[PDB]
Design a protein around this ligand. Structure first.
Ligand SMILES: [Mg+2]
Length: 470
């Protein structure tokens, strides 16, 4: 449970100080995250401020680094808006942006420091929200836009695209104020919530690829084998080359039955079965078979643009630019190819490269897996059975822009959270002793450390994770 009225009041506070700069004609400096949640957040801001005639300059970056801020203070603008980032760096924000106004529309757990009055923090977790379940970066941006203007309710589907991108329904259903965003889109007719297969490929992928690409959760003896998916689908009575949206409601229900019975016969956990069929958000504003018709395929299209340093193009895709959509459509196939090869490399090199301690797996891939896929790689290590569900997994890779730095993402399960693990506070406390930058949610966190201190990090992160148990 969260205080929705208290958080809404803090939203009204940020809206009031933003209208302060809109009246004077100030250009809003928008810094957003490269993830699909961040791309949607920048698109919601661009449309909301556009309805007010305000000027804005959007930059889609990977993280709020120390190097970003000292280049950002000497810019030109008088107000800055951080969407889907900034909560784990407001200590550095009130130092480098002390002489500027800063708005932070983020949902990450924020480090507890006192903020300057010209820096308004709008974070739902300060009002009782779950960091990975109640609201995402696009959700904070949506409520910020909806308070600035009620007409911004037509951005409810774009906000849900970001929530599915951040996997805010990973347990199979939506929670928190995401349901309030859904009810806004339902009253406008731009959004429908079905109970379908929560797998990528509802619109553009054949049914056998949808089953073979399933990594969250995995379908036993079918994930990674398109041939066995073709055969299993056929002797159950389904055309493998048909699309899931081309299935009738009778075929979908029958498909769900065979899939659940399959997971049960092969010993899949109840939690994976419960999250296989759940909330799937569609939008009648788009044709069926188009990836924008479903939220997960929309977010995958947005992640394909941010993967190639083209997040601004994905922002135009959300806004309705059809030429940017045709260019974005040519980026997803290689994005899915690199995910499959990340899982291929994972299954082959796990038992020979992983560093297993008393409370963590630490896998260093070097350059075999790109730095923006270590989060997906850490989750794939858990869903493939390579790692114990109660022991977190951290995957490191060489940073794209600097070889002397390592990008790491930590993922774990809800069962390990019941034991006392807090990946966000563990990586934040570890990064302090490594000259690095850490932080994130209790179930998912990211860290950037120098490559030289890797062996020391493995020892410290295992001790730190061992302290927060009990
Ligand atoms: Mg986010």
């Amino acid at each position: 449970h969260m205080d929705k009225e208290g958080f809404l009041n803090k939203v009204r506070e940020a809206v009031d100080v933003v209208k302060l700069h809109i009246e004077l004609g100030h250009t809003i400096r928008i810094i957003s995250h490269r993830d699909a949640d961040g791309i949607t957040s920048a698109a919601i801001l661009a449309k909301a401020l556009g309805r007010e005639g305000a000027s804005f300059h959007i930059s889609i970056v990977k993280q709020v680094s120390e190097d970003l801020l000292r280049e950002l203070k000497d810019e030109d603008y008088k107000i800055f808006i951080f969407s889907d980032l900034g909560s784990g760096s407001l200590s550095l924000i009130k130092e480098y942006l002390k002489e500027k106004t800063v708005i932070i529309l983020d949902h990450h757990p924020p480090e507890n420091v006192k903020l300057e009055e010209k820096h308004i923090l709008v974070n739902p977790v300060q009002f009782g929200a779950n960091s990975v379940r109640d609201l995402s970066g696009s959700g904070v941006t949506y409520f910020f836009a909806r308070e600035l203007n009620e007409k911004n309710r037509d951005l409810a589907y774009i906000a849900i695209v970001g929530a599915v991108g951040d996997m805010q329904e990973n347990d199979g259903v939506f929670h928190g104020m995401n349901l309030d965003i859904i009810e806004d889109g339902k009253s406008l007719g731009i959004l429908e919530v079905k109970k379908e297969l929560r797998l990528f490929g509802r619109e553009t992928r054949p049914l056998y690829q949808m089953l073979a690409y399933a990594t969250n959760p995995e379908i036993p003896e079918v994930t990674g084998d398109e041939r066995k998916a073709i055969e299993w689908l056929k002797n159950k009575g389904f055309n493998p080359e048909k699309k899931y949206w081309e299935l009738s409601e009778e075929e979908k229900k029958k498909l769900h039955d065979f899939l659940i019975i399959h997971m049960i016969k092969h010993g899949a956990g109840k939690e994976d079965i419960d999250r296989l069929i759940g909330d799937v958000v569609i939008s009648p504003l788009y044709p069926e078979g188009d990836p924008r018709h479903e939220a997960r395929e929309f977010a995958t299209l947005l992640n394909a643009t941010g993967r190639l340093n083209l997040g601004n193009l994905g922002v135009a895709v959300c806004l309705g630019d059809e030429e940017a959509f045709r260019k974005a459509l040519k980026m997803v196939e290689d994005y899915k190819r690199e995910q499959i090869e990340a899982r291929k490399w994972l299954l082959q090199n796990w038992n020979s490269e992983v560093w297993e301690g008393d409370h963590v797996y630490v896998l260093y891939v070097g350059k075999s897996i790109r730095d923006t896929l270590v989060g997906i790689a850490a989750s794939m290590a858990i869903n493939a059975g390579l790692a114990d569900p109660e022991k977190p997994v951290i995957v490191f890779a060489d940073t794209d822009e600097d070889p002397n730095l390592l990008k790491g993402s930590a993922r774990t399960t809800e069962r390990a959270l019941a034991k006392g693990y807090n990946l966000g506070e563990a990586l934040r406390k570890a990064a302090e002793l490594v000259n690095g930058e850490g932080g994130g949610h209790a179930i998912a966190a990211g860290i950037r450390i120098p490559r030289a201190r890797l062996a020391e990090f493995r020892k410290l992160i295992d001790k730190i994770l061992g302290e927060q148990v009990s």
